[PDB]
Amino acid sequence: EDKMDLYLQQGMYGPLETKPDERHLFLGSLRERVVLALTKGQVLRSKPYKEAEHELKNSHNVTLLINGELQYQSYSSYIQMASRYGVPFKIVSDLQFHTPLGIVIAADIAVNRELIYIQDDIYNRSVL
CATH tag, 1-128: 3.30.1330.30
- Domain limits, the chain: 1-128
Note whether 108 and 75 are within 8 A (CB): no
Give resolution in angstroms.
1.4
Could you tell me which of 35, 31, 14, 13 has the C-alpha nearest to residue 22?
A: 31
**Could you give the CA distance from residue 3 to residue 9 in angstroms, rounded to a whole number?**
10
Long-range contacts of 82-89 (CB under 8 A, 24+ apart): 82/56, 84/56, 84/57, 85/56, 85/57, 85/59, 87/56, 87/59, 87/62, 87/63, 88/63, 88/64, 89/63, 89/64, 89/65
